[PDB]
Design a protein around this ligand. Sequence first.
Ligand code: HEM
Ligand code: HEM
Lengths: 498, 498
Amino acid sequence: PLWIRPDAPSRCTWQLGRPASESPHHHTAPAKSPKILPDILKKIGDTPMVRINKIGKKFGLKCELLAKCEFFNAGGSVKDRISLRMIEDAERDGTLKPGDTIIEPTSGNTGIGLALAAAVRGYRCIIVMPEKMSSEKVDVLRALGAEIVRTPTNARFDSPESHVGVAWRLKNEIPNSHILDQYRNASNPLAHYDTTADEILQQCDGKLDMLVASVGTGGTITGIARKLKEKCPGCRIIGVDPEGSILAEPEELNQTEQTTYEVEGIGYDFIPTVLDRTVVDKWFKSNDEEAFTFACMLIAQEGLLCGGSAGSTVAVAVKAAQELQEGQRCVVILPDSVRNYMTKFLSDRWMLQKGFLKEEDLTEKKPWWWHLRVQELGLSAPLTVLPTITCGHTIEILREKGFDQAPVVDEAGVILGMVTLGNMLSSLLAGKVQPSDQVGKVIYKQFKQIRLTDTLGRLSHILEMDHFALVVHERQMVFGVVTAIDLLNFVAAQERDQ
Amino acid sequence: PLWIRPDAPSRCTWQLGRPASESPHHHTAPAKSPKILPDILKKIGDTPMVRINKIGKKFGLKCELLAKCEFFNAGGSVKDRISLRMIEDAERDGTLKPGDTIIEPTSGNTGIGLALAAAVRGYRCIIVMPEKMSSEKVDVLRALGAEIVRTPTNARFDSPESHVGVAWRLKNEIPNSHILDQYRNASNPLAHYDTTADEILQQCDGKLDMLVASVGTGGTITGIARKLKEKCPGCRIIGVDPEGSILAEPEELNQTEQTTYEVEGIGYDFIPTVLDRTVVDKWFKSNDEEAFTFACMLIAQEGLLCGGSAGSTVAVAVKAAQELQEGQRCVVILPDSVRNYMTKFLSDRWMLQKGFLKEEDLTEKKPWWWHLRVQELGLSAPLTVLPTITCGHTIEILREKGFDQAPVVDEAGVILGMVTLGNMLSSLLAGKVQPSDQVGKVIYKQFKQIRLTDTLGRLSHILEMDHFALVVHERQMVFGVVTAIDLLNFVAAQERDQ
Ligand code: HEM
Ligand code: HEM
């Protein structure tokens, strides 16, 4: 029988007030990097501490709010730290030998860190992650040459189909395979205890009043809180847990209907052995809407390209830090980057689809013209030309009729593209085409179709993707041509008319 | 009339051997960052120098190959440097005032850097970029609160529809708007001359034999090469230009059919005024296939999550540096990250679609089982249950018949999902469900369909996305259930049988 419960009680005999010299664990102090790094794994750590300048003030925080931006690690997540530490300790123990296989159950960020170390060091890497995790993590992992296995998102951890159970069964089927088991391996919280806490303390000169950290495995909050209680004992430790997790105390905070949430990498249905909850002074619950609202706000206001778990953490920080006054400081941990979330909360369609954005509030933020018809532009009906026409005859007709542009349409009525006088002349003058050459190449082939009855906001989004909007009916005849410049001229005209 | 040609001859009176004290430009030497950064813009610069350990050896390079990994800047590109410098100089000149509008033609990386500075400082930002540029740049820019305008990819620079022309027309329509014009503004090459060159020299202790840099605007190569010719005059400067650009010398290298290429941010159809070609000792051409092959190789072998322009640069470096011997060093510039290219060269389907991957070479790299039928797994026909069944009766039937799992099918024959004994027991034992509760919860709803006649490689890709593959016919009857574990057991059995 070989399965080790990830929720087993910690056997750690650490308690507050013990001399640091009594630890049985091997500890590695942070060392200065050489001028030239031998490989990219030495670019893990020393992440910047950044002041939050606007958001803190907006919600009435009086204190200085600081963010530890962990997405600047090589893999773009906090887990790159623990992945390296877990490997290096396993190397020193002689457990892990060159060419062995590494297997890991992860929310993906840890998988990325381990796949990267394996690519550099030459381990085979097999990642087990829930189906709920974004595809961008899959694409990065596959590009690193990892094998990937998925598990149902609603599988309970004690089931054989949980990501942990599947990982253990695979380990039992793969020779010379090891599971480093981030939920139980002390190297995770120790990685944060030895380095991240020392970085935070050094950056703050040891002067710190509050820490906010979201908890997935607990390793970050456990390691930081333990070292901080030893060196900065006045610091309050605030845990962030999604609704639908059971990690928060007291249990009354966990009473809930929903069992699944969209934020990735935080919350679980079990208490990891490496999580020491007794060092958390208070828990706060967060939901998905709070997380994505604050993540998009963090990007748009502070320029921090980070993930949703960072949003949850700051969404809690603006509440928990209200008890602090001026001259005090709160530090928030920002675990990962937008790279893993490009098509989720960054895409407005997904946010609408999941119900995190209402159309009403969006319209309150939209310009006066956003709800207006394309017909209000007046437009003008363009000249059309056949595709068999020559470049020279196109220049002749365009100048003689006084048009700068024409849609290329056909006898069958298929619109093939655009030709412009400026580009036709530049291409001839540059010797790129001949007067006898077919327009086929110099044509601008890309455009989007619109109706006279569409809105100007719809035009704006098309112009975020395409230069030309052609106004059509479902007769293929073209009623008008629109660019970003025509819309801008209309808006600026209207701005003068008031 | 207001248009300024981006290809105007440089009026710069710099020449090699001039004392640095004769410069009319305001110069800013690199300063140490404080422990706490006031905003994220101070996280631009100090990018790591990393040894390339495997790729250099693979192509027979005898020298040390080093990479300046610029994708660790806050925006993830080298352009974050110039964006900041261009703004700060414009601030000192009094040209740019608070709340003014910034407009920029860009390949997107510069747009990202400027949109980030505008978000922090409160400028309005309008970005003009070619339609060819990836959507991930659009999503990051929109999330930063930039307005976005596109231009046809094949518009000649002297046409009104080029990204430069459209930017100038917009500037003429928007009050208090400024174009910083990265193609002509000395602040770009000066940003690289003042900082990036000093970083490279410090990291190498001033000992450097070769530099390879890809050229879009030339600011990077111009600034670096000028300072290097002054301080490390023995360093050879190698320029990288895509096929279809005209930047390379002599003109015989530019003779080509194709006018468009998939790599983003390098090459142009004009010579930017800030590019000083006379300081480039040699040009090399690169194509798209070379760029993406080496980018994917750089990720998979060295762990450097970078873009295609970095691939082009290293693909050239392995050729140009063949004349160097041991004890010498070549430095390559890696301009940006994979974040902008998640759905392009990172997606195998796009690479196949563009013809950059052949199926033959892929099959040579595939395992023996990759070309095998699902039928070779033998399988076993599963038990099915109705969705109206209770949790308790499901446990009873599964244990009595000795199955760990069943597909949930219907009277109509629609397969609704999976139920498993382990998860049913865990959910009951945890009090999450009742014996009388409907399976509707505990069901695993996600799975993928397969035919008996599909290949095992197809199964592997499904298992990169889904845990359950159900074997069907187009009778809905289920012929088998497959997970990653069943495939692994088959492979390991076969590995024993030889
Ligand atoms: C004086 C300080 C400490 C002492 C004396 C101590 C002692 C121990 C001992 C005796 C064990 C059992 C060894 C084993 O069974 O593998 C253990 C395990 C462990 N310790 Fe420590 N520890 C200390 C500090 C810490 C710190 C600072 C952390 C994290 C920040 C930590 C995390 C862990 C973990 C995760 C385990 C594994 C738990 C398990 O296997 O159940 N310990 N500790
Ligand atoms: C002793 C050293 C240098 C001297 C005496 C010098 C002199 C000048 C002068 C007189 C101008 C014309 C000013 C104007 O019309 O705006 C100029 C422009 C310029 N310089 Fe410098 N320069 C020096 C070094 C550099 C360096 C090191 C760089 C870049 C690495 C550089 C890049 C430029 C650029 C891009 C322009 C704008 C060109 C234009 O407006 O046409 N120069 N320089």
